[PDB]
Design a binder for this molecule. Structure first.
Ligand SMILES: OC[C@H]1O[C@H](O[C@H]2[C@H](O)[C@@H](O)[C@@H](O)O[C@@H]2CO)[C@H](O)[C@@H](O)[C@@H]1O
Length: 385
């Protein structure tokens, strides 16, 4: 035996969400009960953990287990904040294959998943019955029913935001970065390809034909849906509690089939990661498994409402027979992980600006995308190491 038994392990969990924190406190508590190892759960906001570990880790005051959305994994790995976990393939196979890809980087695994999210078709049950079967039917519904003058819409979403419009680009075969055997090439950006132009042509139609507000934001979409005058939006699970609090009877379905295939959305995965500064990688990895078991994640789902990308649980009635969860899970099963390489960080601004220029009719799809990609490629070589 080499790794000595730790007196304590430290876990950082979301500070802003009470139920997420208390669920982790529960299962950390059960681990302590089982093993006699103290597990301290410290409240730290998800998007503050990476910065805090950069300071506290080297100081010897860092957590053993940390958590944040997977899209910033690349930054963490390259800067040496995290170390790989060593678990058998049987452990990986407890979880959704695509969710596990999100937590893999440079041919190494960095964590086990807690939650998966994707946009889907969220609809007002008083306004929509059977959801459109195809994208063509959905767009026709928008053209027929969108009335900006009366603040009433058939379909309304953040069509000027690439996170939301990704499915339109993916439908045409467009990629952000060229993928080769798990590795993304930051130098081969696909966002000004002919495929990408076809995607942006669809985006343009939402403003030229479906009459969407040309400077819309998240609050425009959410406010109007909560007003009871919007039949359907394209949005994620993060908006559900707000919609229900407003009195909307909410339905959720996968996005209608587009260009003959399932719609492909981005998925975001929140996992547990292992600090590179942990003195107890083996014991901490045992804790990580304990926190992500079938039992632990069933409990986590019921408390937090966040879909656990755990194979058995995804097939459980707790997911499949829940009217505000099932649709998200179905859509998530057809999605792809948001790129996690550091270079993705500087893609959002230029690509979203390109959406704005197209929406406002200031530039053609081709012109806007060409400009956006030029901007990206300059930003990639700028401050990045
Ligand atoms: O506007 C681009 C934006 O996209 C993503 O943000 C998502 C977020 O991940 C979801 O949790 C949800 O809130 O919808 C957001 C859409 O704005 C990226 O995570 C973000 O970095 C990027 O700026």
């Amino acid at each position: 035996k080499s790794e000595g038994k730790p007196d304590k392990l430290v876990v950082w969990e979301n500070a802003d969400d009470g139920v997420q924190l208390n669920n982790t406190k529960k299962w950390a508590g059960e681990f302590t009960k089982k093993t006699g190892i103290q597990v301290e759960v410290v409240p730290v906001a998800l998007l503050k953990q990476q910065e805090k570990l950069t300071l506290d880790g080297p100081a010897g005051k860092g957590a053993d287990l940390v958590t944040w959305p997977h899209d910033r994994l690349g930054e963490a790995v390259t800067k040496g904040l995290l170390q790989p976990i060593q678990v058998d393939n049987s452990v990986k196979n407890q979880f959704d294959d695509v969710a596990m890809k999100a937590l893999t980087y440079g041919g190494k695994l960095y964590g086990l998943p807690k939650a998966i999210e994707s946009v889907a078709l969220i609809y007002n049950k008083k306004l929509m019955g059977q959801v459109p079967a195809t994208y063509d039917e959905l767009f026709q519904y928008a053209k027929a029913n969108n009335k900006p003058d009366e603040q009433k819409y058939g379909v309304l979403f953040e069509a000027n935001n690439f996170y939301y419009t990704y499915f339109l680009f993916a439908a045409k075969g467009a990629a952000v970065f060229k993928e080769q055997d798990g590795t993304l090439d930051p130098n081969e950006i696909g966002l000004n390809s002919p495929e990408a132009v076809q995607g942006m042509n669809e985006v343009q139609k939402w403003f030229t034909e479906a009459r969407l507000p040309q400077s819309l934001k998240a609050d425009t979409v959410n406010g109007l849906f909560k007003s009871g005058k919007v039949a359907a939006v394209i949005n994620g699970p993060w908006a559900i509690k707000d919609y229900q609090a407003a009195g909307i009877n909410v339905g959720v379905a996968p996005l209608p089939k587009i260009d003959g295939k399932d719609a492909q959305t981005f998925i975001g995965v929140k996992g547990w990661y292992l600090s590179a500064y942990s003195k107890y990688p083996k014991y901490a990895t045992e804790l990580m498994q304990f926190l992500t078991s079938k039992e632990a994640l069933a409990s986590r789902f019921k408390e937090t409402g966040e879909i656990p990308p755990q194979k058995e649980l995804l097939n459980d009635p707790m997911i499949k027979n829940n009217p505000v969860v099932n649709g998200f899970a179905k859509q998530a099963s057809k999605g792809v992980p948001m790129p996690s390489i550091p270079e993705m960080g500087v893609v959002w601004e230029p690509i979203n600006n390109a959406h704005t220029f197209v929406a406002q009719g200031k530039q053609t799809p081709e012109q806007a995308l060409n400009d956006a990609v030029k901007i990206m490629k300059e930003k990639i070589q700028t401050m990045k190491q």
